[model samples]
Target: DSKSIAAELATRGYALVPDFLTGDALTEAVAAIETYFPDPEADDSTADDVAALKHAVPFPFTSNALNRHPLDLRVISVVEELLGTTDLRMTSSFIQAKYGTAYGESKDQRLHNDAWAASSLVHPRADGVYQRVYGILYLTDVTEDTAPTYVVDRAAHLGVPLLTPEGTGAYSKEAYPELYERERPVVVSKGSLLLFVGDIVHRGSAYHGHLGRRLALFFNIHGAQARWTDKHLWSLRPAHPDWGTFRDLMIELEPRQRHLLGFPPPGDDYWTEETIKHLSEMYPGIDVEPYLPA
Candidate 1:
């Protein structure tokens, strides 16, 4: 049983452990999420489908039963072995859910190596490179049609480059057909755990008329040698005077270092012009101008 975790991760590129959390423990954790970041479904405002409550939360730190509970330690120990690092930094965490009549498109993230995102700004060093390891825990029963996450196994070995330097576009669908065709759906029951490297091409499946809310907690970890600046996390903060302290800290860091931590460059287009142009064609009256920088 001990060897199962390592063996599964080695071959399948992920491992699912059922009933990792249950009963009172699971209940309390989910409650805290709602208390901190209440959903505004009552007003018909449904904006956070991809990474739920990520931008709404004001705190700099992320919390979960995995970090506070003892049982989760077992899973973390196994993860440490797979990551080849005892020094792990909890980069970020969030809770995601899908509900009834609530329709949302998955964010336009394409298949790409995790290294491409993490090492884009850092010096390319084989040993010191930061590898993003993802750990996902299901809090509700997820079926095939319940918008389960999808992942392509061992596709990272292909090393197919995806995103362009300008952050404009990813590899065309035809370039990495394996990522699209041979991929498998990651369906797991409540209390099941799924762990994988960020390099794998993955996406959140779309849901239509799903009844019960599908709840999940996601965690991203990196090695100690890697320096995590407050780029991605800072972007999540609310743009108010309250965030002045956090923003100032980010400004103090070197530009490249800030980028390494997940900051987007000035005048950077989150999406490429070519990609936005293509999307606008599909949705009429949609303005692609905002995505383009001067």
Candidate 2:
């Protein structure tokens, strides 16, 4: 499935998998989302820059399950399959919520490709040069009425420059209605996963009324050896007031999971006796024995 999915992504520029998290797993993820964002209206506004249609539930989440979600095997398998290697590192991970107001109806975003520093302008290839992998795990059912991400297939928009000179990050729908017509909305049930390469042209749509809230978790990852690509310096987050919550989550993570967040693995050069001792002291409850040299 991962191989086919990888092929799908490489060719189409995006792949959608229904029921990526199902039954109990889906329930757990939703519960975690709710735990952090209990009040759908006020909490969502206060926790985020409400003026922005897309709101972030940033990392250092109080819930251990959420903090560990990006490392879930289902997600990693797809990323590894696409990258064609086990040498992967996460660039960013977070939950995003979109709210619809009684009055706000205009699609709040424009079709654009993500072209960050170190990101490839061309479509991704598995030939080893690093490319960012984007994952969106739906936490709420996305109906046609709800704001869904509208994506244009790479094949359809072959010659369109990804980074436009207008600095709009997208072609104006008014000016280029043909390209806008090519976009298909991604409306799926909760628990589906949308995986896409960085150069895919996509935009988020808008909805109306209080029931129009959509929730999803997102991931940005790339080859581990790649540089200057991080969306955030995750290491600095430990000093946040939620450090205890994050630390508890770290203690629950395996070495592989920890490594995704930039921790040195058991045999990595950073894990000397002195550094290991310092790490142990920094995270007192973590088991250092696994990292101890034989």
Candidate 3:
């Protein structure tokens, strides 16, 4: 199933799996959102005020459910299949809360590819090989009235290059008006997952009506070999003010989960007795027994 979906994705540029997150997993994800960004509890707090709140938080969040979400089997299965490798790495993960704001600049974003940093320098691949996969996990239902993302199919802009001939900038709507017309709104349920490659053109549309807050988690998953492709690394996360939150979460995760976050596995060369002893001291209470040399 994932193999065919990966093939379809290579051509489609994007795919939406409705209700991909449900049951306890869905409830836990939503609960974290509420804990982080709760609505008014009386005291003359208007719904519009809640809608006005906008924030983009980089992981690792205080919630374990949010931190662990990117590696969920449902998500990794599709990402691995798309990249055609079990050796995967999570490049980035972040949460966004967006709604109707007073400023148009904040509400409506220009249509663009996510080829800014690592992607900009490397250039996009023409063949079926995908360097990176971008994912959007909706924490709330998205409707046309709210801010739905507009995505263009890969087939629509086959010859388009992400960077201009002179490498000045990305292709503009004026330069490629036909491509702009092909954009389609992605209206999906609360728990749906939207996965897309970087080659496509996409943008966050403006709010059409007075809707409540929209919460979504974004992630970038790349093949382990795509060393040049990464939006965020986990190395600096421990320096963040909320380091304790992540520390607590990390200690509870199993080897596979830790490995997905870029930690060396049990048998890796980095796991010598002396190093494992130090790691135990660095990450107090985390089990290093698996890394103990025989």
**TM-score on alpha carbons, each prediction:** 0.61, 0.83, 0.84
Q: After best superposition, candidate 1 residue 211: deviation in angstroms? A: 3.8
Per residue, candidate 2 scores C-alpha lDDT tens digits across 147-264 of: 8888886523456665566754477777567778888899899999898886677888886445446878887777764555564455445567878877787788777677677777
For 134-177, candidate 1 gives per-residue lDDT tens digits of 67777767887676777776443556544545462244466657
**lDDT per model, in order?**
0.54, 0.71, 0.72
Which model, 1 or 2, shows the larger lDDT?
A: 2
Taking all chains together, the TM-score of candidate 1 against the true structure is: 0.61
Instruction: Candidate 2: list runs displaced more than 4 Å.
Output: 38-54, 103-106, 118-127, 155-157, 174-176, 235-240
Best by TM-score: 3
What is the lDDT ranking, best to worst? 3, 2, 1
- Segments in model 1 whose C-alpha atoms lie over 4 Å from true places: 1-3, 34-71, 100-109, 116-119, 123-130, 162-171, 228-294
Local accuracy of candidate 3 as per-residue lDDT tens digits, 1-294:
677667767878888888888999899999897665654432344555555655678887878878887777666777777776777777788898765443233466656666434645565553333456778899989998778888886633556666765463345667778767777899999999888876667888777654356788888776666556653654545677778778877788777666667778777888786898887776899888887777
What would the C-alpha RMSD of candidate 1 be, to one decimal place? 15.1
Q: After superposition, how far is residue 217 of candidate 3 from its true place, in Å?
A: 0.5
Ranking by TM-score: 3, 2, 1
Cα displacement (Å) at residue 170, model 2: 2.5
Q: For model 2, what is the error of residue 277's alpha carbon versus the real structure, in angstroms, after optimal superposition?
A: 2.2
